[PDB]
Amino acid sequence: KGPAVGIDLGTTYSCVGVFQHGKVEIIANDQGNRTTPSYVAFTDTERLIGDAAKNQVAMNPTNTVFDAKRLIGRRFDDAVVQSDMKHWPFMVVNDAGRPKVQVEYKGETKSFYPEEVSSMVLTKMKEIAEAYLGKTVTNAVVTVPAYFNDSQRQATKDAGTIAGLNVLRIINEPTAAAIAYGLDKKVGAERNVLIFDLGGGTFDVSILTIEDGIFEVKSTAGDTHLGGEDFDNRMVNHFIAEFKRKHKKDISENKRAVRRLRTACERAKRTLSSSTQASIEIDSLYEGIDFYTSITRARFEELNADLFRGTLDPVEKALRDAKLDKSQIHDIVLVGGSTRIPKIQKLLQDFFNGKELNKSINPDEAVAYGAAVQAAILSGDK
Ligand SMILES: Nc1ncnc2c1ncn2[C@@H]1O[C@H](COP(=O)(O)OP(=O)(O)NP(=O)(O)O)[C@@H](O)[C@H]1O
Ligand SMILES: [Mg+2]
């Protein structure tokens, strides 16, 4: 038999973890990455999932699906869906009220319910675990945002079943992050924890109260359309202007030039979280012109100043709704790949008057980490 695993099914990135020998192991994929893009792509000859999928989006924009988490368990008539679809390069049709993604696979036109797309990503995570564990993975704990209603939770459970996973339990993402740090241990009296989650495309702030081992989501806030992608876009717009300056050519119209530039920016951004400047080396970006440049962390922070700063507004609201003061929150844990940005860390710490931030576990692996632990206890492995 095999161990149960914990899976973070994210909007942009997903992650798998497994508790074994009192330690949690975050499993890397085929490309060696510890998190894999929640991307699925359909071509003439195959269906690509994960890195392979994202690594060809600029070439196959209408048949490469992403953001399935924004659709899952929702209706077509949903104002959310209606708004979101205005920015998706892939087709989304109404099917008796339910939204469906329409793609072209092997010449034939095919459609999928959002839960089917997510099951594909889930299958990828499962095989990643299996490759590592050297055994079949059946049981799993999958995470979901705290605000997900019954339909969304149902659809997520369904995605699991059709993926061949026996979903032991669906737990909230903030709660999984708290468990990763062991903030669920009984210490007598209440503990207020603030989960600051800034991922690839969403921002969630959750204030949890934990007494006797029971979690209570006191308040939540954030922005469904604020994430690392927005930071990348600011770099893109910055570089489009620079190319136009140096070569008097506007590459905006060329969707491929822009997507290749975005991929380069996202990578330079990650480097910036550990270095003061990074170089952008793109061969033959537009026409036959190579675009060789670099950005400094200062210029980067400067391009996103208003965005970074605005991050504190949802924090303030969460506090007031929860009826607490800065001084009353006991622990602050960082979740999401974007929390690795030094400026975001400074900004939050300054706001909480120097309080220490919980960030020893990679923020983008925190949710999976907690789910893995939770899976183990539910399986008697712990
Ligand atoms: N070193 C880093 N510095 C800055 N951003 C990073 C770094 N490493 C990863 N990221 C970004 O973090 C995002 C990935 O976040 P992650 O939390 O893994 O996603 P997720 O849970 O799918 N997020 P969300 O889209 O909000 O649901 C992307 O915008 C990456 O560029
Ligand atoms: Mg997330």
mmCIF file of C-alpha atoms and ligand atoms in Angstrom, residues 8 10 173 197, ligand 2:
data_model
loop_
_atom_site.group_PDB
_atom_site.id
_atom_site.type_symbol
_atom_site.label_atom_id
_atom_site.label_comp_id
_atom_site.label_asym_id
_atom_site.label_seq_id
_atom_site.Cartn_x
_atom_site.Cartn_y
_atom_site.Cartn_z
ATOM 1 C CA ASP A 8 -2.122 22.360 -3.266
ATOM 2 C CA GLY A 10 -3.344 26.509 -7.146
ATOM 3 C CA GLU A 173 -5.558 26.837 2.307
ATOM 4 C CA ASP A 197 -1.126 34.828 0.737
HETATM 5 MG MG MG B 2 -2.048 29.527 -3.558
#
